[PDB]
Design a protein around this nucleic acid. Structure first.
Ligand SMILES: [Mg+2]
Ligand SMILES: [Mg+2]
Ligand SMILES: [Mg+2]
Ligand SMILES: [Mg+2]
Ligand SMILES: [Mg+2]
Ligand SMILES: [Mg+2]
Ligand SMILES: [Mg+2]
Ligand SMILES: [Mg+2]
Ligand SMILES: [Mg+2]
Ligand SMILES: [Mg+2]
Ligand SMILES: [Mg+2]
Ligand SMILES: [Mg+2]
Ligand SMILES: [Mg+2]
Ligand SMILES: [Mg+2]
Ligand SMILES: [Mg+2]
Ligand SMILES: [Mg+2]
Ligand SMILES: [Mg+2]
Ligand SMILES: [Mg+2]
Ligand SMILES: [Mg+2]
Ligand SMILES: [Mg+2]
Ligand SMILES: [Mg+2]
Ligand SMILES: [Mg+2]
Ligand SMILES: [Mg+2]
Ligand SMILES: [Mg+2]
Ligand SMILES: [Mg+2]
Ligand SMILES: [Mg+2]
Ligand SMILES: [Mg+2]
Ligand SMILES: [Mg+2]
Ligand SMILES: [Mg+2]
Ligand SMILES: [Mg+2]
Ligand SMILES: [Mg+2]
Ligand SMILES: [Mg+2]
Ligand SMILES: [Mg+2]
Ligand SMILES: [Mg+2]
Ligand SMILES: [Mg+2]
Ligand SMILES: [Mg+2]
Ligand SMILES: [Mg+2]
Ligand SMILES: [Mg+2]
Ligand SMILES: [Mg+2]
Ligand SMILES: [Mg+2]
Ligand SMILES: [Mg+2]
Ligand SMILES: [Mg+2]
Ligand SMILES: [Mg+2]
Ligand SMILES: [Mg+2]
Ligand SMILES: [Mg+2]
Ligand SMILES: [Mg+2]
Ligand SMILES: [Mg+2]
Ligand SMILES: [Mg+2]
Ligand SMILES: [Mg+2]
Ligand SMILES: [Mg+2]
Ligand SMILES: [Mg+2]
Ligand SMILES: [Mg+2]
Ligand SMILES: [Mg+2]
Ligand SMILES: [Mg+2]
Ligand SMILES: [Mg+2]
Ligand SMILES: [Mg+2]
Ligand SMILES: [Mg+2]
Ligand SMILES: [Mg+2]
Ligand SMILES: [Mg+2]
Ligand SMILES: [Mg+2]
Ligand SMILES: [Mg+2]
Ligand SMILES: [Mg+2]
Ligand SMILES: [Mg+2]
Ligand SMILES: [Mg+2]
Ligand SMILES: [Mg+2]
Ligand SMILES: [Mg+2]
Ligand SMILES: [Mg+2]
Ligand SMILES: [Mg+2]
Ligand SMILES: [Mg+2]
Ligand SMILES: [Mg+2]
Ligand SMILES: [Mg+2]
Ligand SMILES: [Mg+2]
Ligand SMILES: [Mg+2]
Ligand SMILES: [Mg+2]
Ligand SMILES: [Mg+2]
Ligand SMILES: [Mg+2]
Ligand SMILES: [Mg+2]
Ligand SMILES: [Mg+2]
Ligand SMILES: [Mg+2]
Lengths: 65, 116, 151
RNA sequence: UUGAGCCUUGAUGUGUAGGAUAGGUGGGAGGCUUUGAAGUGUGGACGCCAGUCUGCAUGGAGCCGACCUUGAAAUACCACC
RNA sequence: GCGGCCCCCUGGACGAAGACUGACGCUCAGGUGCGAAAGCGUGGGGAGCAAACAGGAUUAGAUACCCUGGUAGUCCACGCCGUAAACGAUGUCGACUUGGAGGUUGUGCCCUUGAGGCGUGGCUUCCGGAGCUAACGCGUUAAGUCGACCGCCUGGGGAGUA
RNA sequence: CGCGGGGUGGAGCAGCCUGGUAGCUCGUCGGGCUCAUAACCCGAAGAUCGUCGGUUCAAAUCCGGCCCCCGCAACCA
RNA sequence: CGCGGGGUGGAGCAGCCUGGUAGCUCGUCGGGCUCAUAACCCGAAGAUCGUCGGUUCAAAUCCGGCCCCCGCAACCA
RNA sequence: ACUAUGUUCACG
């Protein structure tokens, strides 16, 4: 997070923040995530992942492209 | 009168506002400006430009103190901050460093109820 | 047109002042397809303008049209859900054409006597920016300048 | 401590005429200058940013009052506010 | 149902190769025990959140949704409650019947000869064969093929009510 | 019977105790929008003010009778 | 009873003690906006100082009254 | 952002 960028540079470049926290503090601990709903919305994000990964193996179809 | 060399610019960038407040080394507040105080009321108050103008309005009204360089301590998420820091250069300061003070509770208080 | 990118038709030069800028101005002024009546008025207006201003006709019409020209105009898009004021940089073809409308639209009102008199007086006021057409550009800027928060 | 009253002293005070970031009024025409000057290097006090004010010195002993613009004349000396 | 880190006492699980006991087992009507959340009693505690409640918007109305407040509750000690879409909507135990890709925790054999490999056990996620199924689907963790015992079902409303 | 207060378009209220030209929120009526109805937008009409009377230049508004309506009193023995 | 302050477009405010330039927020109509409504934003329509009097180069401004103006402590016929 | 309703039996 503590980003100096030497001296001649300035132009923000603080992906250190954006690829670390932000989403964790904000869109998660902003409003009430009802204990059960994570167990639901994770397991569907998790089921959607292997759905794509299993399909990616069988994605090599005829195509003709 | 005083004439401080360096300072710190705390930016409380919420969803609805962006409060810019310039302080000294020991956190002694020297002057401030907001998106709502700049004009920009309602929908306009939550934009990157209405943050920029607030930091420009905070850049002046701290000239009696005569700050050459300052650090940045952004807070909250908001539309501002990735825009407000641009304004502090364009106004006339040197950014020594950029940091966060974004309050991350290690699962502490129950957050408010989810809305629909 | 939804995906039909086709250009526009070519126009023609006006015999006595063979160019293009004022050829379009005749067309925007014209009512009921009467280009004979309209083109006589524009010559009558620009001759009376050149007498008073002490310039030619093209440069007299230019130092007038630029003073009523919009730099930015206001649209409003709903991207996400809500409706808010989005200013945009006007295109160079429409830029001077949108000005020519505001001169003529102002000259419909302001009932002096003749049309040739009214356009001459409107373009005369445009040269010293104190007419109705400059006020319509002035208001258009005030929207873009005030509603600059929205990109 | 930081207020208010109060004397010494020192500035301060740009409708417009306009060489003047001049409040009203006045003793009345030489002050001052070698009781080491005009112009300025530089920085301070002030600043409605028009242009005041001045530490010290390379410099070296001049600068200038009625005149012309004002409802008013010059902090050149000096009295009272 | 159970997530900061540390000690105190403590139940089980799995593996390794033995030694021992010698059918001591499997189910279980009545019965007992545990049993989320919300409740209930008594004594604390109370930041945040928040039923009820109040005000402001919304609306034709708004006892709602949105906004600002905000008490029981939510937390702890000791009892009571005994229910949930308490759900793999799939009773418990055992045997048997092609596979593949992972994860996770074991344990043995060679070179640890370099984040190796090669085997044999538990638990587990996904896709599929035969077979089954009304179909959807299930598919060695069966809803396949059989056995033991239990619970339950018999049109919808009335009613899981009197 | 006694003393306050009322009676105003179709509804509920102002304007009434200081006499000069009657509003508000609904509904009714006309036109829009909609496939149509509601909602919504846009115009419009609609009360001589309980009645019989007096005062006045003129009374919904002042004063008197009568006709209803509503409250309070109707007590000591 | 007083001594005091206070007095502006329709209205709330300052500005009024150191005379030369009456601002500022809601009521105001036209825009831009959008398939539209709300908002939001831009500019327009109104007081020469409640009002009358002295002086002085210039007076809401300095000074006296009023209508009056509210505050007060005092007023025990 | 909010945004209600569509009388009865029939025709297939
Ligand atoms: Mg769960
Ligand atoms: Mg909230
Ligand atoms: Mg843990
Ligand atoms: Mg703990
Ligand atoms: Mg143990
Ligand atoms: Mg064990
Ligand atoms: Mg044995
Ligand atoms: Mg034996
Ligand atoms: Mg034996
Ligand atoms: Mg039984
Ligand atoms: Mg039983
Ligand atoms: Mg129990
Ligand atoms: Mg509980
Ligand atoms: Mg309790
Ligand atoms: Mg009780
Ligand atoms: Mg008890
Ligand atoms: Mg207690
Ligand atoms: Mg309690
Ligand atoms: Mg308590
Ligand atoms: Mg509490
Ligand atoms: Mg307590
Ligand atoms: Mg709360
Ligand atoms: Mg709430
Ligand atoms: Mg309650
Ligand atoms: Mg309520
Ligand atoms: Mg509705
Ligand atoms: Mg209503
Ligand atoms: Mg309401
Ligand atoms: Mg309610
Ligand atoms: Mg409510
Ligand atoms: Mg209770
Ligand atoms: Mg505990
Ligand atoms: Mg407890
Ligand atoms: Mg029990
Ligand atoms: Mg049950
Ligand atoms: Mg469960
Ligand atoms: Mg589950
Ligand atoms: Mg399971
Ligand atoms: Mg069940
Ligand atoms: Mg079971
Ligand atoms: Mg069992
Ligand atoms: Mg059992
Ligand atoms: Mg089995
Ligand atoms: Mg196998
Ligand atoms: Mg396998
Ligand atoms: Mg494996
Ligand atoms: Mg496996
Ligand atoms: Mg291997
Ligand atoms: Mg195994
Ligand atoms: Mg599985
Ligand atoms: Mg199965
Ligand atoms: Mg499955
Ligand atoms: Mg399968
Ligand atoms: Mg197997
Ligand atoms: Mg197999
Ligand atoms: Mg398996
Ligand atoms: Mg096997
Ligand atoms: Mg097995
Ligand atoms: Mg099995
Ligand atoms: Mg297995
Ligand atoms: Mg079976
Ligand atoms: Mg079956
Ligand atoms: Mg049975
Ligand atoms: Mg039975
Ligand atoms: Mg039955
Ligand atoms: Mg039963
Ligand atoms: Mg029940
Ligand atoms: Mg029962
Ligand atoms: Mg009525
Ligand atoms: Mg009237
Ligand atoms: Mg109506
Ligand atoms: Mg009418
Ligand atoms: Mg009639
Ligand atoms: Mg009379
Ligand atoms: Mg009379
Ligand atoms: Mg009348
Ligand atoms: Mg009247
Ligand atoms: Mg008395
Ligand atoms: Mg209905």
């Amino acid at each position: 997070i503590k980003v100096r960028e030497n001296e001649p540079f300035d132009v923000a470049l603080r992906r250190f923040k954006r690829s670390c926290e932000k989403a964790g503090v904000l869109a998660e601990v902003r409003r009430r995530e009802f204990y059960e709903k994570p167990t639901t919305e994770r397991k569907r994000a998790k089921a959607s992942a292997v759905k794509r990964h299993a399909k990616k193996l069988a994605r090599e179809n005829a195509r003709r492209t | 009168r005083k004439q401080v060399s360096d300072g710190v610019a705390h930016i409380h960038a919420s969803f609805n506002n962006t409060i810019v407040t310039i302080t000294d080394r020991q956190g002694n507040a020297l002057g401030w400006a907001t998106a709502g105080g700049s004009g920009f009321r309602g929908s306009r108050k939550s934009t990157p430009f209405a943050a920029q103008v607030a930091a420009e309005r905070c850049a002046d009204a701290v000239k009696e103190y005569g700050i050459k360089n300052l650090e940045v301590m952004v807070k909250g998420p908001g539309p501002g901050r990735e825009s407000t820091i641009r304004a502090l250069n364009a106004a006339g300061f040197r950014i020594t460093n950029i940091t966060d003070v974004t309050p991350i509770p290690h699962n502490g208080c129950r957050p408010p109820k989810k809305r629909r | 047109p939804r995906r039909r990118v086709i250009g526009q038709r070519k126009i023609l030069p006006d015999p006595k002042f063979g160019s293009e800028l004022l050829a379009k101005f005749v067309n925007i002024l014209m009512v009921d397809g009467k280009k004979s009546t309209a083109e006589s008025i524009v010559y009558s207006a620009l001759e009376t303008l050149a007498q008073r201003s002490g310039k030619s006709e093209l440069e007299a019409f230019e130092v007038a049209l630029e003073n009523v020209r919009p730099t930015v105009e206001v649209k409003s898009r709903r991207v996400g859900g809500s409706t808010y004021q989005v200013p945009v940089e006007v295109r160079p073809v429409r830029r001077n054409a949108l000005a020519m409308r505001w001169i003529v639209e102002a000259a419909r009102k302001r009932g002096d006597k003749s049309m040739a008199l009214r356009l001459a007086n409107e373009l005369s006021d445009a040269a010293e920016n104190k007419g109705t057409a400059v006020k319509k550009r002035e208001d258009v800027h005030r929207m873009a300048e005030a509603n600059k928060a929205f990109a």
